[PDB]
Design a protein around this motif. Structure first.
Motif, PDB file in Angstrom:
ATOM      1  N   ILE A 136      48.337  40.111  24.479  1.00 22.09           N
ATOM      2  CA  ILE A 136      48.389  38.803  23.834  1.00 22.09           C
ATOM      3  C   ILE A 136      48.415  38.954  22.317  1.00 22.09           C
ATOM      4  CG2 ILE A 136      46.948  36.798  23.320  1.00 22.09           C
ATOM      5  CD1 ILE A 136      48.740  36.558  25.777  1.00 22.09           C
ATOM      6  N   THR A 137      47.564  39.830  21.778  1.00 23.80           N
ATOM      7  CA  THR A 137      47.443  39.939  20.327  1.00 23.80           C
ATOM      8  C   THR A 137      48.660  40.575  19.666  1.00 23.80           C
ATOM      9  OG1 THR A 137      45.958  40.616  18.545  1.00 23.80           O
ATOM     10  CG2 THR A 137      46.390  42.205  20.290  1.00 23.80           C
ATOM     11  N   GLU A 138      49.572  41.172  20.432  1.00 23.33           N
ATOM     12  CA  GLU A 138      50.755  41.798  19.856  1.00 23.33           C
ATOM     13  C   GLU A 138      52.041  41.042  20.150  1.00 23.33           C
ATOM     14  OE1 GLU A 138      50.767  44.865  23.629  1.00 23.33           O
ATOM     15  OE2 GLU A 138      50.761  45.681  21.592  1.00 23.33           O
ATOM     16  N   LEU A 140      52.097  37.184  21.134  1.00 26.19           N
ATOM     17  CA  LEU A 140      52.003  35.840  20.574  1.00 26.19           C
ATOM     18  C   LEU A 140      51.827  35.877  19.062  1.00 26.19           C
ATOM     19  CD1 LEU A 140      51.774  32.745  21.141  1.00 26.19           C
ATOM     20  CD2 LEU A 140      49.308  33.104  21.267  1.00 26.19           C
ATOM     21  N   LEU A 141      51.171  36.912  18.543  1.00 26.86           N
ATOM     22  CA  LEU A 141      50.971  37.088  17.106  1.00 26.86           C
ATOM     23  C   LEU A 141      51.470  38.468  16.696  1.00 26.86           C
ATOM     24  CD1 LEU A 141      49.503  35.267  14.832  1.00 26.86           C
ATOM     25  CD2 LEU A 141      47.716  37.011  14.978  1.00 26.86           C
TER      26      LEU A 141
END
Lengths: 145, 761, 107, 87, 146
Positions: A136-138, A140-141
């Protein structure tokens, strides 16, 4: 039979102006029947614990049938109920589902339900998942904008 | 767009709140990488500016507070809270210099109990090990390479504590002024986040003495002055969440007070045992000086020499009073000190000692009166608040119960031996922090490295009570049952980590006795779990079961019966199985389990003889269970189906030299002969004791007759008479094992008996 | 192929030697984007040594030919600074890095 | 010989065990009746359909935990201690 | 209390022991008001399962056995001296019953529950009418006595 019926009704390439294949008095009764079927499945899998576990067998079809133009209402709420009431399917989520969710978020506006689903997708019932959070952290952002 | 705009763009504000929720959920339960990633976006200056600002909306303020909590002061808080139930005191002059400290200044026994958490408390807890965030450091070229995860970003603790203190002061001043404009638009958004922050900082342990004194003063400036204006939070109508925060604050303060009390009791205990040792040495010296003119010299020698230290200590201490009975071999000097200490401790608790609105002038009475006052208000609609309230109320009325629960988790560590203790505690904290996270390759590598860096500790060798307490064996078992069970065929996932675990289990079995029993029942659960799932190769838990009952002489007598039935059923199922892994490994399909059968026989060998004897109950039970099912111990080749043991061993020999059925290190003949040797050894060790009990009963005679009828004569002698290899071109474990002859001799001696002709032959 | 825009005011004629330690006061700035790092926000200068790697090689070679108190715009090319992989979650892949390093070490 | 010449840690642990097996936990408190009397005596400090302030919220909470879903429940040492105290 | 005892089924953990002890404590002396309240509650709710839970709980009670006694005697015979293991080898020789206190408490609670001569609880226990399942606790008690 409900999944087969949804698949047969979803053979339309756009489900907007392809009603000539079926004929008259079908174009008007398309969005309402699709939403009604989605809400019927939604109320069906809502509240029950064993039903969500039984239905948590083919999440790829639900993910693929998420950004079906008009299908923003409903459908997503089914996945939310499956995630909340059955915290065991959250094991086979690859990058394809995350990419589809991000595409839906960027295509259907800033809907809070999408962020709620993404929030529920990381933490499980008392156990954290490193793979889902790192994915998710790479994705979506990956930066900004 | 401006942050301060709340009246318009309500959908945008809801979106930002849910974005903060997503950020907090991503940074939950570890994951220092996403912590640094969020520190890149929401940096330190932005967090402090959002903290100091008061015109911000409610939900965004709460989200920012909880985001800061979950980013910076989360992992250290969880690690320190996971070990708040452990109390360890060293032996330093500071420990001897701290006691209950009664207020003797114009007072005494009938004085205050002192402000809790004023410092000078000593214990052994690991440091938090923060690290400053950075973004100009190149990543290492090697992938992971057993990297020790990361560390949470560091922020100035003193400045944050000062900001929190001034924030709480401003909040309580505004509450006293009764302003109509809350900071967050409501009392909740004004009080709950700052209370949560100050509670996390108090659990952190950053405050010194003056800060804690100021906090206690501003909580209730009525009965905290022993050291109308500025009314405390306890005299203000507040919602449920503020009540929850204050309840947690009071619970933390009471826990700190209990830790101080148990440390003082430990110091008193050290002083008392030093005095007792000195008095015992003096008494022994006087007895040596004058040991004649007596009649109970032998009795005194047996009492003070031929007795365990536990019994001697219990006799010399529990007989000090015996409800005014005396009859103790101790003078009346330390008795007065013990009585005074006991009276002081009972006065410190909630006991009046005399008979069994008003100013409390204490903490227990204050919290009891406050809880009763809150109960006297309207009915509380929050079940969790009611539960926490009642837990706090009950926890402050029975000091004996909490003391009895806390004493088993107390110990005294040798001076200048704290480095190893810190290393062990840090390793245990890391183990727990990786337990609360789902399994995987990097975390299993880190766990293996940690459990390999814990072996050379010089602490696990001694002091069994450290591991008997805490419950770290339970944590290891939870970890291993999580990686083994729960996913049917997911047991084979993540191998090569059970080896270190099983070594640890065997060592913990071999340390002591009560730990041996506890891990015995736990390992029985483990063998059941392995049987439901067929087990695994390598460091099989069945080997741990065999190694755990090497010498007990107490568990085997009271060992159950259904576990033996499960074991023999699993052995029969393995014998009737076709070994799918062996055929895929390059071996012919044979309906028999060599490795599983050999391991089961090895385990059953270690669960019969106990300490060289033979328990008749377990022997007859295992005989009945083994012989009840004909499809056991290789029914198609042992002789049940119409074959012979001599023919079977001859076929195994013919396979052994120049094999052709199998391809490529464990072949069939060696496995067959090892299985037969293990079975015959088990049968020999199962003989009903000796001739001392077989001459009076008939069950032993029946067992001997059945055993003699099971295997025919002229078989062991023929096996022994078979020639061996060259006596000392190199050979390995493929031919006859010399230990097989020892098993044959043992079975012949313990079953058949002795005569003249057979003995000479 | 790195452009440097030195700002002449700020004096300084002490080039950084090899092996000693000097401090920096830079603020991060992504190309055609936003600000991601700032040493001024943390109110703490960054300390690092010269000649022992531990930083971006492009950043080091951009800061090598600089004097004390002389800020500039060190544009780091992406193929050697962070490569095609990049930092997973902060810096997007194959993006240039722009910093304005300020020197305040008293040596 | 086994008494003296011993590390202080064994003596401290042994003293702790002996003090645990001592005159403590001998029902020398009798505080349960006092607390029960002190709770229900506060019916209304300053106050028809209103539920009593003490000894009723606890009972309702325990009943609502009884009437919950998800099969049976475990742990809950609070109900343990409170039932033991009342008895 | 009636809801707590109707939640746990079959399991003989400390939950049931504490509930039965509280039932002894509240019903000591046999107050008519408490019995009337319990009868009214059971008639109003008409919930089945409490009798089933009681029957399952009493069915798994403990009785004396010979092999267990022989094992306990062998354990008490010791034969070796360990590090103060005499007091930890057995729980004061309670390995033969381990359930006498709980069984006595349960039977005492049943006795205090049915002690009045109202002739109302006896008919309910023999054959309850508000539920569609009969348990007939008397026959099970006779089997336990046998």
């Amino acid at each position: 039979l409900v999944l087969n019926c949804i698949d047969r009704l979803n053979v339309y390439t756009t489900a907007a102006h392809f009603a000539e294949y079926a004929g008259e008095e079908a174009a008007e009764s398309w969005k309402e029947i699709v939403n009604l079927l989605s809400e019927l499945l939604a109320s069906l899998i809502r509240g029950n614990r064993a039903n969500c576990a039984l239905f948590s067998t083919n999440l790829d079809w639900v993910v693929s049938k998420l950004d079906r133009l008009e299908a923003s209402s409903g459908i997503l709420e089914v996945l939310y109920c499956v995630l909340i009431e059955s915290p065991e399917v959250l094991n086979i989520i690859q990058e394809n589902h995350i990419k589809s969710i991000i595409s839906l978020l960027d295509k259907h506006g800033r809907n809070h339900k999408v962020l709620d689903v993404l929030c529920s997708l990381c933490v499980c019932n008392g156990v954290a998942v490193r793979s889902n959070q790192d994915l998710i952290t790479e994705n979506l952002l990956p930066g900004r904008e | 767009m401006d942050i301060l705009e709340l009246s318009e763009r309500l959908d945008l504000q809801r979106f930002h709140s849910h974005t903060l929720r997503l950020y907090r959920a991503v940074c939950a339960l570890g994951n220092n990488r996403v912590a640094h990633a969020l520190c890149s976006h929401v940096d330190q200056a932005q967090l402090l500016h959002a903290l100091e600002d008061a015109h911000l909306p409610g939900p965004l303020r709460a989200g920012y507070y909880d985001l800061l909590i979950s980013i910076h002061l989360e992992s250290a808080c969880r690690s320190r809270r996971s070990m708040l139930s452990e109390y360890i005191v060293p032996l330093t002059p500071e420990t001897r210099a701290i006691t209950l400290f009664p207020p003797g200044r114009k007072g005494g026994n009938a004085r205050r109990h002192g402000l809790p958490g004023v410092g000078v408390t000593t214990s052994l807890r690991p440091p938090h090990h923060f690290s400053p965030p950075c973004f100009v450091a190149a990543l290492p070229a090697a992938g992971v390479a057993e990297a020790p995860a990361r560390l949470s970003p560091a922020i100035p603790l003193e400045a944050l504590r000062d900001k929190a203190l001034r924030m709480l002061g401003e909040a309580v001043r505004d509450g006293g002024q009764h302003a109509r404009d809350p900071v967050g638009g409501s009392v909740e958004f004004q009080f709950v986040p700052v209370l949560k922050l100050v509670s996390t900082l108090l659990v952190m342990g950053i405050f010194g003495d003056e800060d804690v004194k100021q906090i206690l003063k501003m909580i209730e400036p009525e009965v905290f002055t022993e050291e109308d204006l500025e009314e405390g939070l306890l005299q203000m109508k507040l919602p449920e969440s503020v009540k929850l925060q204050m309840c947690n604050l009071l619970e933390y303060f009471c826990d700190q007070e209990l830790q101080h009390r148990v440390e003082s009791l430990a110091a008193f205990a050290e002083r008392y045992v030093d005095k007792l040792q000195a008095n015992q040495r003096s008494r022994y010296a006087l007895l040596m000086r004058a040991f004649t003119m007596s009649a109970a010299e032998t009795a005194r020698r047996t009492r003070e020499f031929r007795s365990p230290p536990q019994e001697q200590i219990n006799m010399l201490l529990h007989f000090k009073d015996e409800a005014d009975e005396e009859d103790c071999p101790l003078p009346e000097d330390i008795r007065q000190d013990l009585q005074d200490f006991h009276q002081d401790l009972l006065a410190h608790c909630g006991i009046q000692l005399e008979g069994e609105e008003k100013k409390p002038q204490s903490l227990q009475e204050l919290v009891s009166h406050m809880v009763v006052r809150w109960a006297q208000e309207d009915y509380v609609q929050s079940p969790e608040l009611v539960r926490a309230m009642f837990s706090l109320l009950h926890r402050q009325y029975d000091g004996l119960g909490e003391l009895l629960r806390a004493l088993p988790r107390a110990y005294t560590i040798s001076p200048s031996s704290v480095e190893d203790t810190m290393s062990l505690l840090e390793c245990l904290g890391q183990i727990r922090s990786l337990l609360i996270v789902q399994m995987g390759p990097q975390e299993e590598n880190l766990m293996i490295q940690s459990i390999g860096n814990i072996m050379n500790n010089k602490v696990f060798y001694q002091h069994p009570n450290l591991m008997r307490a805490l419950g770290m064996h339970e944590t290891v078992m939870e970890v291993m049952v999580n990686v083994l069970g729960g996913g049917e065929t997911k047991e084979i996932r993540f191998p090569k980590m059970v080896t270190s675990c099983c070594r640890f289990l065997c060592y913990f079995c071999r340390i002591s006795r009560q730990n041996q029993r506890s891990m015995f029942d736990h390992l029985s659960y483990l063998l059941e779990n392995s049987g439901i799932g067929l087990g695994m190769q390598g460091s099989t838990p069945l080997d741990v079961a065999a190694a755990s009952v090497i010498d007990n002489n107490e568990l085997a007598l009271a060992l159950q019966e259904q576990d033996l039935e499960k074991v023999v059923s699993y052995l029969a199922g393995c014998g009737l199985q076709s070994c799918p892994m062996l055929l895929a490994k390059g071996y012919p399909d044979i309906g028999w389990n060599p490795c599983g059968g050999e391991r089961y026989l090895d385990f059953l060998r270690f669960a019969v003889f106990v300490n060289g004897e033979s328990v008749e109950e377990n022997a007859n039970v295992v005989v009945r269970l083994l012989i009840r099912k004909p499809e056991c111990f290789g029914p198609a080749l042992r002789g049940e189906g119409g074959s012979g043991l001599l023919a079977a061993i001859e076929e195994a020999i013919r396979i052994s030299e120049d094999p052709a059925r199998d391809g490529p290190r464990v072949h069939l003949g060696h496995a067959i002969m090892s299985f037969y040797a293990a079975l015959i050894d088990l049968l020999g060790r199962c003989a009903p004791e000796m001739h001392l009990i077989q001459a009076g009963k008939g069950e032993a005679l029946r067992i001997r007759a059945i055993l003699r009828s099971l295997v025919p004569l002229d078989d062991l002698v023929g096996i022994i008479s078979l020639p061996l290899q060259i006596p000392t071109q190199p050979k390995m474990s493929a031919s006859f094992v010399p230990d097989h002859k020892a098993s044959m001799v043992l079975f012949l001696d313990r079953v058949y008996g002795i005569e003249n002709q057979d003995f000479l032959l | 192929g790195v452009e440097i825009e030195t700002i002449s005011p700020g004096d300084g004629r002490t080039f950084p030697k090899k092996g000693q330690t000097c401090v920096v006061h830079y603020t991060g700035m992504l190309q055609n984007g936003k600000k991601f790092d700032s040493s001024r926000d943390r109110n703490k200068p960054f300390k690092f040594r010269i000649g022992k790697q531990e930083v971006i090689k492009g950043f080091e070679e951009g800061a090598a030919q600089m004097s004390l108190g002389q800020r500039a715009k060190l544009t780091c090319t992406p193929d050697v600074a962070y490569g095609a992989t990049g930092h997973p979650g902060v810096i997007p892949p194959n993006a240039t890095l722009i910093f304005d390093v300020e020197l305040l070490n008293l040596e | 010989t086994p008494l003296y010449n011993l590390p202080t840690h064994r003596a401290c642990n042994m003293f702790l065990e002996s003090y645990k097996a001592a005159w403590i936990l001998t029902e020398d408190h009798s505080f349960e009746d006092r607390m029960i009397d002190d709770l229900s005596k506060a019916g209304e400090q300053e106050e028809e359909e209103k539920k009593p302030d003490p000894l009723h919220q606890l009972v309702l909470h325990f009943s609502r935990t009884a009437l919950t879903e998800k099969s049976k429940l475990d742990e809950d040492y609070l109900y343990m201690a409170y039932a033991d105290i009342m008895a | 209390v009636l809801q707590m005892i109707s939640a746990c089924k079959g399991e003989t953990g400390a939950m049931v022991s504490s509930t039965l002890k509280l039932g002894i404590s509240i019903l000591n002396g046999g107050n008519a008001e408490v019995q009337q309240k319990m009868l009214d509650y059971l008639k109003d709710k008409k919930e089945v399962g409490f009798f089933q839970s009681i029957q399952a709980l009493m069915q798994t009670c403990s009785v004396l056995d010979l092999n267990a006694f022989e094992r306990q005697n062998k354990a008490e015979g010791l034969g070796m001296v360990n590090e103060d293991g005499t007091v930890i080898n057995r729980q004061n020789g309670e390995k033969v019953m381990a359930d006498d206190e709980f069984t006595q408490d349960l039977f005492r609670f049943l006795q205090l529950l049915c002690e009045g001569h109202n002739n109302d609880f006896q008919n309910y226990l023999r054959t309850q009418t508000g539920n569609t399942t009969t348990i007939n606790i008397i026959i099970c008690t006779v089997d336990y006595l046998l």
